[PDB]
Design a protein around this ligand. Structure first.
Ligand SMILES: CSCC[C@@H](NC(N)=O)C(=O)O
Length: 339
């Protein structure tokens, strides 16, 4: 449809202008108070912070430059920030500021107090098909947007889908996102969500995102992922076999869609055929979906997360509060020049 073509053309124009001239150094650390550690990993953490002048809350992702270098994540961290400062879509968490100092890299994101889809899914067990479909439609549109910009997301999983105050998804964590025209080769993503071509160390493309969508829809509707096993090697063996067992409660339409998304042969996988995303959007499982209404956030969500306000952290987990230090000496300045 020309309306969608023209929408995506404008989206790409606006992305490219920011991509080619990225914003830098748009806030500083001492304009924020630290409130609580919301997550932590091997080279960084995410903090709830409050801006001292406006009172606004944000989720601040803080990466230790020395650890980024040591764990060979330099390009990934530069990808994440350059992409986030250039994208704009209703179901992507917004980057509001970024900056760096002697020790760390900072991305100041909107804070979504409703928490991760993962916690809501694990609490209730599984989502009904309408509920899963509401979230899946938002991911389809988001991947249509990202892929049109030549971006591969590469980290789809329930933990990275936050549920906002209207019950809609906001995708977070662009740590593995990359602008790719053609193929790319890095081993990354979470085991249960990896496409076979990643496991097999092949050059792969945006079709890995559509595979991961199949995993996500299965997990939302079943309560567990399709290739589950105790050990990673067993997960990988199941993935590359592609044998998937569907619960009897799955509709026939859902099983058909999942067979086409969880297609081991990437040249036969929905999302990667001549009709692209339209094979997914036109599938019978999505017959009830008004794609424009979803994009415009006019559909009433299946549920609204419970939270008390923009500073409520009750939907996130508790972590040891550790210092955020800034060395008196600049570290790794060269490697992060463009950040
Ligand atoms: C807002 S997160 C950073 C706050 C923290 N760090 C420094 N070095 O000032 C501190 O004041 O201890």
């Amino acid at each position: 449809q020309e309306s969608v073509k023209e929408f995506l053309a404008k989206a790409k124009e606006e992305f490219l202008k920011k991509w080619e001239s990225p914003s830098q150094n748009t806030a500083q650390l001492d304009h924020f108070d630290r409130i609580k550690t919301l997550g932590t990993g091997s080279f960084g953490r995410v903090m709830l912070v409050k801006h001292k002048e406006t009172g606004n809350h944000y989720a601040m992702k803080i990466l230790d430059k020395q650890k980024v270098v040591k764990l060979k994540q330099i390009e990934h961290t530069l990808n994440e920030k350059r992409i986030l400062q250039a994208v704009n879509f209703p179901f992507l968490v917004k980057l509001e500021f970024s900056f760096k100092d002697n020790s760390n890299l900072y991305m100041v994101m909107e804070y979504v107090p409703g928490g991760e889809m993962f916690s809501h899914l694990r609490r209730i067990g599984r989502f009904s098909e309408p509920h899963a479909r509401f979230y899946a439609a938002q991911i389809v549109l988001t991947f249509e947007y990202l892929h049109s910009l030549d971006l591969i997301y590469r980290d789809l999983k329930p933990e990275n889908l936050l549920i906002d105050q209207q019950g809609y998804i906001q995708v977070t964590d662009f740590g593995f996102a990359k602008r790719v025209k053609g193929r790319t080769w890095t081993l990354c993503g979470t085991p249960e969500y990896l496409a076979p071509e990643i496991i097999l160390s092949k050059g792969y493309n945006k079709a890995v995102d559509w595979w991961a969508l199949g995993v996500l829809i299965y997990e939302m509707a079943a309560g567990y992922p399709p290739f589950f096993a105790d050990q990673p090697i067993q997960i990988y063996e199941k993935i590359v076999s592609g044998k998937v067992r569907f619960p009897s409660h799955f509709s026939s339409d859902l099983k058909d869609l999942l067979r086409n998304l969880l297609q081991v042969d990437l040249t036969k996988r929905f999302g990667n055929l001549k009709n692209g995303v339209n094979d997914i959007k036109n599938h019978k499982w999505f017959a009830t979906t008004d794609w424009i209404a979803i994009y415009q956030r006019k559909v009433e969500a299946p549920f609204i997360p419970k939270f008390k306000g923009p500073g409520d952290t009750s939907n996130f987990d508790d972590y040891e509060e550790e210092e955020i230090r800034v060395s008196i000496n600049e570290k790794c300045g060269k490697e992060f020049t463009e950040f």
